[PDB]
Design a protein around this motif. Structure first.
Motif, PDB file in Angstrom:
ATOM      1  N   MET A   1      -3.439  19.215   7.632  1.00  0.00           N
ATOM      2  CA  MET A   1      -4.126  20.468   7.306  1.00  0.00           C
ATOM      3  C   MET A   1      -4.829  20.348   5.963  1.00  0.00           C
ATOM      4  O   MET A   1      -6.005  20.723   5.820  1.00  0.00           O
ATOM      5  N   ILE A   2      -4.082  19.822   4.999  1.00  0.00           N
ATOM      6  CA  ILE A   2      -4.574  19.618   3.633  1.00  0.00           C
ATOM      7  C   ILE A   2      -5.817  18.731   3.648  1.00  0.00           C
ATOM      8  O   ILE A   2      -6.836  19.036   3.003  1.00  0.00           O
ATOM      9  N   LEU A   3      -5.694  17.644   4.397  1.00  0.00           N
ATOM     10  CA  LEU A   3      -6.768  16.660   4.518  1.00  0.00           C
ATOM     11  C   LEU A   3      -8.015  17.307   5.099  1.00  0.00           C
ATOM     12  O   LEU A   3      -9.107  17.046   4.607  1.00  0.00           O
ATOM     13  N   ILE A   4      -7.814  18.131   6.125  1.00  0.00           N
ATOM     14  CA  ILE A   4      -8.891  18.871   6.775  1.00  0.00           C
ATOM     15  C   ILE A   4      -9.761  19.646   5.790  1.00  0.00           C
ATOM     16  O   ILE A   4     -10.981  19.570   5.890  1.00  0.00           O
TER      17      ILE A   4
ATOM     18  N   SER B   1       0.897  -1.151   0.000  1.00  0.00           N
ATOM     19  CA  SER B   1       0.000   0.000   0.000  1.00  0.00           C
ATOM     20  C   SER B   1       0.913   1.172   0.000  1.00  0.00           C
ATOM     21  O   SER B   1       2.031   1.063  -0.470  1.00  0.00           O
ATOM     22  N   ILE B   2       0.426   2.297   0.485  1.00  0.00           N
ATOM     23  CA  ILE B   2       1.262   3.423   0.810  1.00  0.00           C
ATOM     24  C   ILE B   2       0.326   4.416   1.450  1.00  0.00           C
ATOM     25  O   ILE B   2      -0.728   4.679   0.886  1.00  0.00           O
ATOM     26  N   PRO B   3       0.676   4.959   2.628  1.00  0.00           N
ATOM     27  CA  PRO B   3      -0.283   5.866   3.196  1.00  0.00           C
ATOM     28  C   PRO B   3      -0.307   7.189   2.453  1.00  0.00           C
ATOM     29  O   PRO B   3       0.622   7.540   1.727  1.00  0.00           O
ATOM     30  N   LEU B   4      -1.397   7.903   2.655  1.00  0.00           N
ATOM     31  CA  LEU B   4      -1.592   9.181   2.035  1.00  0.00           C
ATOM     32  C   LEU B   4      -0.535  10.175   2.441  1.00  0.00           C
ATOM     33  O   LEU B   4      -0.217  11.029   1.620  1.00  0.00           O
ATOM     34  N   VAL B   5      -0.026  10.076   3.675  1.00  0.00           N
ATOM     35  CA  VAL B   5       0.988  10.978   4.191  1.00  0.00           C
ATOM     36  C   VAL B   5       2.209  10.995   3.296  1.00  0.00           C
ATOM     37  O   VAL B   5       2.728  12.070   2.931  1.00  0.00           O
TER      38      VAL B   5
ATOM     39  N   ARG C   1       3.701  14.054   1.056  1.00  0.00           N
ATOM     40  CA  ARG C   1       4.868  14.663   1.641  1.00  0.00           C
ATOM     41  C   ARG C   1       6.152  14.252   0.938  1.00  0.00           C
ATOM     42  O   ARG C   1       7.028  15.078   0.738  1.00  0.00           O
ATOM     43  N   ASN C   2       6.283  12.984   0.594  1.00  0.00           N
ATOM     44  CA  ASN C   2       7.528  12.482   0.059  1.00  0.00           C
ATOM     45  C   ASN C   2       7.493  12.288  -1.462  1.00  0.00           C
ATOM     46  O   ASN C   2       8.554  12.232  -2.089  1.00  0.00           O
ATOM     47  N   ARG C   3       6.298  12.198  -2.053  1.00  0.00           N
ATOM     48  CA  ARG C   3       6.151  11.892  -3.481  1.00  0.00           C
ATOM     49  C   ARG C   3       5.845  13.131  -4.299  1.00  0.00           C
ATOM     50  O   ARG C   3       6.593  13.469  -5.215  1.00  0.00           O
ATOM     51  N   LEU C   4       4.733  13.789  -3.980  1.00  0.00           N
ATOM     52  CA  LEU C   4       4.375  15.059  -4.611  1.00  0.00           C
ATOM     53  C   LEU C   4       5.104  16.236  -3.983  1.00  0.00           C
ATOM     54  O   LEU C   4       5.298  17.266  -4.636  1.00  0.00           O
ATOM     55  N   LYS C   5       5.472  16.093  -2.712  1.00  0.00           N
ATOM     56  CA  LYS C   5       6.147  17.144  -1.958  1.00  0.00           C
ATOM     57  C   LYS C   5       5.299  18.416  -1.752  1.00  0.00           C
ATOM     58  O   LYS C   5       5.845  19.494  -1.500  1.00  0.00           O
ATOM     59  N   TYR C   6       3.970  18.271  -1.818  1.00  0.00           N
ATOM     60  CA  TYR C   6       3.047  19.363  -1.524  1.00  0.00           C
ATOM     61  C   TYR C   6       3.172  19.794  -0.092  1.00  0.00           C
ATOM     62  O   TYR C   6       3.085  20.983   0.201  1.00  0.00           O
TER      63      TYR C   6
END
Ligand SMILES: [Mg+2]
Ligand SMILES: [Mg+2]
Ligand SMILES: [Mg+2]
Ligand SMILES: [Mg+2]
Ligand SMILES: [Mg+2]
Ligand SMILES: [Mg+2]
Ligand SMILES: [Mg+2]
Ligand SMILES: [Mg+2]
Ligand SMILES: [Mg+2]
Ligand SMILES: [Mg+2]
Ligand SMILES: [Mg+2]
Ligand SMILES: [Mg+2]
Ligand SMILES: [Mg+2]
Ligand SMILES: [Mg+2]
Ligand SMILES: [Mg+2]
Ligand SMILES: [Mg+2]
Ligand SMILES: [Mg+2]
Ligand SMILES: [Mg+2]
Ligand SMILES: [Mg+2]
Lengths: 144, 149, 146, 257, 129, 172
Positions: free
Chosen positions: D62-65, D40-44, D48-53
Motif C-alpha cells: 500500500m505504502i509503495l503504491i 541485499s535486503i528487500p524493501l519489505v 516491516r521488520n526494521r522501521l516497523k512502519y
RNA sequence: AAAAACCGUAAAUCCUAUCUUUUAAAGGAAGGAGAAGUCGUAACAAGGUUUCCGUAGGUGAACCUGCGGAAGGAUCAU
RNA sequence: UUCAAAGAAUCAUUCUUUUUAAAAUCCGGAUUUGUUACUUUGAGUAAAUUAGAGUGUUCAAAGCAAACAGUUAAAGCAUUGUGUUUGAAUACUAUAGCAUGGAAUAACAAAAUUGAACAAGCU
RNA sequence: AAGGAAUUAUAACAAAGAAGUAACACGUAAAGUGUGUAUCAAUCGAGUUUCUGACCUAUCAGCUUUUGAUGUUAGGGUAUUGGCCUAACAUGGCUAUGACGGGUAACGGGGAAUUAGAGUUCGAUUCCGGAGAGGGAGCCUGAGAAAUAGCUACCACAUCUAAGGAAGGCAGCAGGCGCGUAAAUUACCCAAUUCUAAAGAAGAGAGGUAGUGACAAGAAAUA
C-alpha cells in the motif's frame, strides 16, 4: 608388542581388520546379513497377522512337565506356517480354529523362550480383541 | 643375523682416539701408493685393509688418510664396477648353482641358494638406489657366472 | 617432421605474413621453457604455445606413463586421515595431463600441472613445470607425499 | 519442468534479514536488481521488520503504491526490491532520509541522515570496462554503470557518486592506509584503516585492517568497501562507529546501564 | 630392531625406578631423549645425568631421586591440536593437579601446560607422574 | 546427447539416473553442400539463432598476404582432413580446401598495381601465380558453415599450399 | 498441408544367452528335539588294550588295526 | 647438522629483552635464507538443529521477543512537534581446498672412478 | 586499460551481417510514467567443471577396446568445453591404495539417537541438492521443460460410447480400495507467510485455521 599395528600411517590395516572381524560378532552378523529378511517369518517386523490352522499342544523341556498350548498359524503377509504359544490360564479356547490372530515375538528376537522347544511367537490378539483383555475378562469379550 | 637364527655380536670396534697414534711414521702419500699396489695385485677392499693392518704398521687408513680406502681406490680409478660384498654374494650363488647342477637332490643347498639370491636382490637393490650399480642390472641365474669377472 | 597429420598443423595466433612464432607466459611464475620459444612443434593444447590458459588448481604429481601421444599420467600420492583410528593411510589418484613436447618427460619425473579446460574425456590438466627426479622400482609404487 | 526458483523459504532466508521460524513459512525473495540477495535486503523487510512502519506485506505494498519511497532518489513500487549496502532511502511523507549501513553484527540498520549528505552515495567499483569509442565505464556494487569515469579510478576503489545527477564527485583510492568498512564475514560491521594487502597470485587478495582499538583483523579484498582517507570517513557511520567489541566487553557495556 | 630409541630409554628408566636403582645407563642417547631428560630434571623427577660421549650414539647414565612413579612414551606420535589436548591428558595422566604430558611442539619440546600457555599443540612424545 | 551414457575410464558402466536434459542437446549435422544458397535457422538456447547453411557457393574469401577479402563462387571441394567421403559429397566444413573462382583477386590486383592499405613489396608466390593463370585457386574454409551460415575462407599460401598440393598428389 | 525416401534419436514386441532370485520333486544323506526303545561299553580311574594326533585299511555300532608323531601320561628321577 | 649464553620483573620457578656465525640486500649502520607433513592464526562458509548470550511464554517445553516512564505529564530532543533504550550475540560449518607465524618432531630434496665458488684472461 | 596468465577490453584495415534505434498507451511531475527495444554490465540463476570425501562383499581378480575403451589430428555438433559425435591414426586407460562385478530392506547432505571420552546406529521425513510423475522413448512452446493437472508413440492398467470414436495418469489436497504390524477431514479461509498477474483490490488444497490425534515434547488436578 601389541598385536595390532600402531603406526601413524597404519590406518588402512586397522580399518580393514576390523571390517573383516566384525563379522565374527554374532549379533552384528544377525543385524547385517541379508538372510534376515529372507529367513524370518515376520520379515523384519514387530508383529504379523496369521489365520490359525491348528490348535496344538507342545510338550515342554525335560525338567519341567507341561503341555504348552500353541497355535500353528499361517501368516497372511508371508504364507509362512509358525507355532505361536498362547498365554493365559485358559486362553487356547478363547480363539477359534480359524481366527485372524495377531502374533508378536516372544521377547528374545528369534531365539526361543523358556520351557518351550522352538516356538518363538506369542499370539496377542484374536479377532482384534486383546488376548490379555480376554484373559482378564472384566475388560472384554471376544466378538464374533 | 639377517637370515639364520644366529645372534652373535663378534665385531671389530675401533678405538676412541681417531686422530692417528703417535708411533705411526708413514706419511699419507706412501700409504696411498701401497693401497694402490695392493689393489693392482688383485686384493679386494677388506682384504687390502687387513693387509695394511698386518704387514705394514697402520691400524686404519681413515686416521692416516682423511679418506677411507674404497674412496681412495675410486679416486685412483681402480674401483670395481661391481661392489665387494655384492660380488662375493654373487660368487657364492654361482658356486651353489654349480653344485645344484651337478647334484640335484641337495635340498638344504637349494634352500640356502634361495636365501643368498634374496640377499643379493636386497644388496643389489640398495646399490641401484645409490649409483654403484646401473639401473639396468637384474642379476640373472643364467648370466651370473660371467658377471663376477 | 612437423606436419604429420592429414591437416596442416599451423599454430593459431602465429600471424605469418604481416607484423614486426607464438608463445605466451601462462603466469604463476612458471617460466616458459626454451623449447617452446625456440624449437618448432605445433600444439593446440600446450599451455605456452597453444590456446589453453591454465587457471584453477595447480598440483604436483609424479609421472607414471608417457605412452599416450603428448599426454602423461601422474599419480598424486597423499594421506587420507581416518578419525576413528586417528591415523592416516596412503591413498592415490591418477590425473591424466596433457604434456606438450617442450617437456621431455620419462617416468618417475615429478611434474606440476595447472588446471585448464576439458581437453579430452579425462585430461583436465597440463604440465607446466617438470622437475627431473630419478626412480628405481616402478613409479606406480613410489610414494612421494607432496 | 525445472528453471529458476521464485520462492524463498523462511529458514533458508539469510540470517541478517532476522526473520522468524514461526511467523511465516516463506520469505520475500529479493527481486533481481542491483544487489546480490545474500548481501541485499528487500524493501519489505525494511518497511516491516526494521522501521516497523508496516505490520504486514499488504501495508508495505500500500505504502509503495503511493509513489513516496525513493531508493537512490528514483521511486520504487516493487515490494521485494533489494536495497543493499550503501543506498539512501527517502521516505517522502515523514521527510525522513535513511542510509542503509551495517551494524557491528551482520545486521542492516537504517541509519537516519541529513538532506545535505543524502544527495551523494558511496559506490565501490568492481569492474572497469572499455567499450566502443575507447570510453571506460566503471561498474559499481550498486549494479550501476558509471560511464566516462575519471581515468585514475582503479578496480577496487570507492567513488562518491551524486544522486540528483548520475555524475561522480570524487574518488578514494584503495591505499595502504585508507579508512575502510567491511561487508561479509565475521568482521562485517568493522571499520578500520588497513595495515597491509597480500596480493596473492592466483587466489583471493587477503587484506589486514587495523581498527581504532588497534585490533587487527584480516578479510578478503572482495568484500571491503573503501569509506575514507585515514582521517575522516566520507559518510556518517552508525553510533558504534564500526568498533566490534569483544564479547566480554560487550556484556560489560550492557551491564553498565 | 630399535625404532624409537626414546621409548626404550624411558622403559629402562621406569624399570630402574621400579627396582629402586639410583643410577641407570640409557644406552643410545638422542637429542630428543636428552631434551626429555632435561625437561624431567626441570620438573624435579630426575637428578643429574652424565651424557657420556663415545664416538658413536652416546650413552647417558642418569641419576634418579626415587621420585618417578612412571614415565613413558606414547608411540604413534599423534599430531595433537591445542583443543584436542585436554581430553588426551584426561585419558593419560593420573590427576589434573600433576604429571606431565610432553609434546614436541614447533617451539621445542614442552609439557601440556606449557603448550597451553604458548598456544601451539604439536606431536605428543610421552609423559610422567 | 552431449552427455554421459559412456564408460567411466576404468571401463565401468555408468548406471544412468537422469533422462536427457535438453541442455544436453545434440541436434543433427548439417552436411552443407555446394549449390545455390539455402540456409535455415535453428533456435539455439536463449533465442540465440544460428544459421545452418545447407547449400552454399558465394563465400567471402581472404588473401592473407595482402590482408584483403572478396566474395566468390566456390567451384569445387578438393580435400578434407576429416574424411574423403565429405569431399566426394562436396561438403563444406571449417577446414575444407576448396577451389575459388579466383578472377576477383586478380582484378583487384590489376586495379591496384600492375597485372598479376598498401604494404606491397611481398608481391606474390610462384605456385599461387600459376594457379591464378588458370583462373581457379585453392583456399581453406574458416567459418563453420553449419553454424555461421557462410563459407568464409582464405587463400592457401606458400608452405601450407605446398603441403596441400603434396597431399593431393595424383601419382597413382 | 498430406504423403513419401534417407540418415539419427528409438519406444515396444518376439527369439535366443547369460545371470540373479524365490520355488517344486521320487529318492538320498545329514543335522537338532523328543520319548525311562534296541545293541553293545567307546571315553572319564593304568576306565580294565593309557589317551590323543595325522594318515591308510577295516568293521553292526560305538570303534579296531598299521605307520610316524604328542603328553593334554600312569615316568620331571640311575 | 646452531648447541647455548647473558640481563630485568615475580613467588627453586613464571614472562620478557639482548647476542653468538655465513651469504645476499639497503645508506660503519639496517633488513632475506630448502619443500611437504605437522601445528598456530586467519580468511570463507545458509539457516533450522547443537552448544551458547540475553529475555519472568504465569513456570516450563517455547519463542525472538522485549524493557522503561504516565488515570494519560513530566523528563529528554526538535525547530506547538516528537515516545526512548534497544535485542535478535558468539561459537560450532570437515578428514580436503585457501592464505598464514613456526625454532621441535617427521619425511624428501639437495650432496665425489669426482662437485661448485670466486679472481684473471679469451670468445 | 586491466588480469597470475589473452587470440581479453579495445583500435585499425578487407569482407559479409542478424536483430534493432517507438507508425504503441496513459496523464501524469514540480518536464512524468507505462509497454517495447540493439549491445554491455549487474542480478535471479543454470550448465559444465577441479580437488577431497561413502556403506557391505575377494565364495566378485582381472577389467575396458568391432559396439569410443585411452589418447592425437581434423571436423561435426553444442550456448560453450569435451569421444559429446564422425573420420583418420596411435594402443592406450583402470587395477590387490580392491579395478570390474554383486548386494544394499541406499537418494546425498544439513542432521537424529545414543556416548565420559572415543565411537555405534539412523537420516523416506521442516532446509539445500538430486531424481521421478504407471513404464520406457520422443518432441512443441518458451529465457528456462526433454514439462507430464503440455503434446506424440508404444507397453501396462484402465473410463465413457448410440460401438463410429473419445479422454485418461493423486509420488498436489482431501477421499476411496488394496496392501498391510503400521498412519487423520471428501472440513473453513486467503486474514497471516509468500508467489503469480494487465501486480493494494484477483487467484493460490502453496500457505494458513480448525477437525481426528495418549507419535513425541512441556506444565499440571485427584485435596
Ligand atoms: Mg627377516
Ligand atoms: Mg643383537
Ligand atoms: Mg522432470
Ligand atoms: Mg596295562
Ligand atoms: Mg570303556
Ligand atoms: Mg582304554
Ligand atoms: Mg580283520
Ligand atoms: Mg582289524
Ligand atoms: Mg572412430
Ligand atoms: Mg532405494
Ligand atoms: Mg534425508
Ligand atoms: Mg524405501
Ligand atoms: Mg501411482
Ligand atoms: Mg515427461
Ligand atoms: Mg495429478
Ligand atoms: Mg503416460
Ligand atoms: Mg492423496
Ligand atoms: Mg499409528
Ligand atoms: Mg496475501
Amino acid at each position: 608388542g601389541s598385536g595390532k599395528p600402531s603406526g601413524l600411517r597404519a590406518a588402512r590395516k586397522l580399518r580393514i581388520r576390523r571390517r573383516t572381524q566384525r563379522w565374527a560378532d554374532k549379533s552384528y552378523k544377525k543385524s547385517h546379513l541379508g538372510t534376515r529378511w529372507k529367513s524370518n517369518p515376520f520379515r523384519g517386523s514387530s508383529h504379523a497377522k496369521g489365520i490359525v490352522v491348528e490348535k496344538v499342544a507342545i510338550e515342554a523341556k525335560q525338567p519341567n512337565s507341561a503341555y504348552r498350548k500353541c497355535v500353528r498359524v499361517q501368516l497372511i503377509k508371508n504364507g509362512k506356517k509358525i507355532t505361536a504359544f498362547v498365554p493365559g490360564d485358559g486362553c487356547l479356547n478363547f480363539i477359534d480354529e480359524n481366527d485372524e490372530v495377531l502374533v508378536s515375538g516372544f521377547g528374545r528376537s528369534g531365539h526361543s523362550v523358556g520351557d518351550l522347544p522352538g516356538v518363538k511367537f506369542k499370539v496377542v490378539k484374536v479377532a482384534r480383541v486383546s488376548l490379555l483383555a480376554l484373559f482378564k475378562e472384566k475388560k472384554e469379550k471376544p466378538r464374533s | 643375523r639377517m637370515y639364520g637364527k644366529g645372534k652373535g655380536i663378534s665385531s671389530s670396534t675401533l678405538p676412541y682416539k681417531r686422530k692417528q697414534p703417535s708411533w705411526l711414521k708413514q706419511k699419507p702419500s706412501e700409504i696411498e701408493d701401497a693401497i694402490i699396489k695392493l689393489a693392482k695385485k688383485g686384493q679386494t677392499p677388506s682384504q687390502i685393509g687387513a693387509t695394511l693392518r698386518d704387514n705394514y704398521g697402520i691400524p686404519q687408513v681413515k686416521s692416516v688418510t682423511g679418506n677411507k680406502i674404497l674412496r681412495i681406490l675410486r679416486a685412483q680409478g681402480i674401483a670395481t664396477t661391481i661392489p665387494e660384498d655384492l660380488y662375493f654374494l654373487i660368487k657364492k650363488a654361482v658356486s651353489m648353482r654349480k653344485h645344484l647342477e651337478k647334484n640335484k637332490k641337495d635340498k638344504d643347498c637349494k634352500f640356502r641358494l634361495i636365501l643368498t639370491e634374496s640377499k643379493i636382490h636386497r644388496i643389489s637393490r640398495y646399490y641401484k638406489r645409490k649409483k654403484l650399480l646401473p639401473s639396468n642390472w637384474k642379476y640373472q641365474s643364467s648370466t651370473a657366472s660371467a658377471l663376477i669377472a | 617432421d612437423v606436419q604429420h597429420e592429414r591437416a596442416y598443423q599451423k599454430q593459431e595466433g602465429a600471424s605469418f605474413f604481416n607484423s614486426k612464432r607464438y608463445w605466451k607466459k601462462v603466469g604463476l611464475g612458471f617460466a616458459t621453457p626454451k623449447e617452446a620459444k625456440e624449437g618448432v612443434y605445433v600444439d593446440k593444447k600446450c599451455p605456452f604455445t597453444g590456446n589453453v590458459s591454465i587457471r584453477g588448481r595447480i598440483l604436483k604429481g609424479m609421472v607414471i606413463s608417457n605412452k599416450m601421444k603428448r599426454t602423461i599420467i601422474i599419480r598424486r600420492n597423499y594421506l587420507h586421515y581416518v578419525k576413528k583410528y586417528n591415523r592416516f593411510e596412503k591413498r592415490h589418484k591418477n590425473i591424466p595431463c596433457h604434456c606438450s613436447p617442450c617437456f621431455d618427460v620419462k617416468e618417475g619425473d615429478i611434474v606440476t600441472v595447472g588446471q585448464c579446460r576439458p581437453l579430452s574425456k579425462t585430461v583436465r590438466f597440463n604440465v607446466l613445470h617438470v622437475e627431473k627426479h630419478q626412480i628405481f622400482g616402478s613409479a606406480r609404487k613410489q610414494f612421494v607425499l607432496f | 519442468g525445472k528453471g529458476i526458483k521464485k520462492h524463498l523459504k523462511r529458514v533458508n532466508a539469510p540470517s541478517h534479514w532476522m526473520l522468524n521460524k514461526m511467523g511465516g513459512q516463506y520469505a520475500p525473495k529479493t527481486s533481481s536488481g542491483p544487489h546480490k540477495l545474500l548481501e541485499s535486503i528487500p524493501l519489505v523487510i525494511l518497511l516491516r521488520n526494521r522501521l516497523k512502519y508496516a505490520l504486514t506485506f499488504d501495508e508495505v505494498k500500500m505504502i509503495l503504491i503511493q509513489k513516496i519511497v525513493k531508493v537512490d532518489n528514483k521511486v520504487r513500487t516493487d515490494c521485494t526490491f533489494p536495497v543493499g549496502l550503501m543506498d539512501v532511502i527517502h521516505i517522502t511523507k515523514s521527510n525522513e532520509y535513511f542510509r542503509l549501513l551495517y551494524d557491528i553484527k551482520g545486521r542492516f540498520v537504517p541509519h537516519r541522515i541529513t538532506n545535505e549528505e543524502s544527495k551523494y552515495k558511496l559506490c565501490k567499483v568492481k569492474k572497469i570496462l572499455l567499450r566502443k569509442g575507447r570510453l571506460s565505464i566503471a561498474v559499481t556494487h550498486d549494479g550501476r554503470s558509471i560511464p566516462y569515469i575519471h581515468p585514475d579510478v582503479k578496480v577496487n576503489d570507492t567513488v562518491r557518486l551524486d544522486l540528483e545527477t548520475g555524475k561522480v564527485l570524487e574518488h578514494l583510492k584503495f591505499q595502504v592506509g585508507s579508512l575502510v568498512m567491511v561487508t561479509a564475514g565475521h568482521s562485517v560491521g568493522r571499520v578500520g584503516v588497513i595495515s597491509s594487502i597480500d596480493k596473492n597470485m592466483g587466489t583471493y587478495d587477503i587484506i589486514h585492517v587495523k581498527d581504532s582499538r588497534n585490533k587487527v583483523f584480516a578479510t578478503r579484498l572482495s568484500n571491503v568497501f573503501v569509506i575514507g582517507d585515514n582521517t575522516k570517513p566520507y559518510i556518517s557511520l552508525p553510533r558504534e562507529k564500526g568498533i566490534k567489541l569483544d564479547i566480554i566487553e560487550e556484556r560489560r557495556n550492557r551491564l553498565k546501564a | 630392531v630399535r625404532m624409537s630409541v626414546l621409548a626404550d630409554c624411558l622403559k629402562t628408566i621406569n624399570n630402574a625406578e621400579k627396582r629402586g636403582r639410583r643410577q641407570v645407563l640409557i644406552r643410545p642417547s638422542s637429542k630428543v631423549v636428552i631434551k626429555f631428560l632435561q625437561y624431567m630434571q626441570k620438573k624435579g623427577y630426575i637428578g643429574s645425568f652424565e651424557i657420556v660421549d663415545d664416538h658413536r650414539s652416546g650413552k647417558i647414565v642418569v641419576n634418579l631421586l626415587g621420585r618417578i612413579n612412571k614415565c613413558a612414551v606414547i608411540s604413534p606420535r599423534y599430531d595433537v591440536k591445542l583443543d584436542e589436548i585436554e581430553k588426551i591428558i584426561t585419558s593419560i595422566l593420573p590427576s589434573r593437579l600433576f604429571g606431565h604430558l610432553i609434546l614436541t611442539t614447533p617451539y621445542g619440546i614442552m609439557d601440556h601446560e606449557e603448550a597451553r600457555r604458548k598456544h601451539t599443540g604439536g606431536k605428543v612424545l610421552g609423559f610422567f607422574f | 546427447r552431449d552427455g554421459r551414457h559412456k564408460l567411466r575410464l576404468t571401463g565401468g558402466k555408468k548406471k544412468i539416473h537422469k533422462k536427457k536434459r535438453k541442455y544436453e542437446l545434440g541436434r543433427p549435422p548439417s552436411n552443407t553442400k555446394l549449390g545455390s544458397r539455402q540456409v535455415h535457422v535453428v533456435r539455439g538456447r536463449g533465442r540465440n539463432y544460428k544459421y545452418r547453411a545447407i547449400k552454399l557457393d558465394s563465400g567471402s574469401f581472404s588473401w592473407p598476404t595482402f590482408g584483403i577479402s572478396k566474395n566468390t563462387r566456390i567451384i569445387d571441394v578438393v580435400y578434407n582432413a576429416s574424411n574423403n567421403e565429405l569431399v566426394r559429397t562436396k561438403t563444406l566444413v571449417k577446414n575444407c580446401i576448396v577451389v575459388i573462382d579466383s578472377h576477383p583477386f586478380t582484378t583487384w590486383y590489376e586495379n591496384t598495381f600492375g597485372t598479376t592499405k598498401i604494404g606491397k613489396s611481398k608481391n606474390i608466390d610462384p605456385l599461387l601465380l600459376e594457379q591464378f593463370k588458370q583462373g581457379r585457386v585453392l583456399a581453406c574454409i574458416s567459418s563453420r558453415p553449419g553454424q555461421c551460415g557462410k563459407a568464409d575462407g582464405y587463400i592457401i599460401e606458400g608452405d601450407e599450399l605446398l603441403f596441400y598440393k603434396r597431399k593431393m598428389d595424383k601419382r597413382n
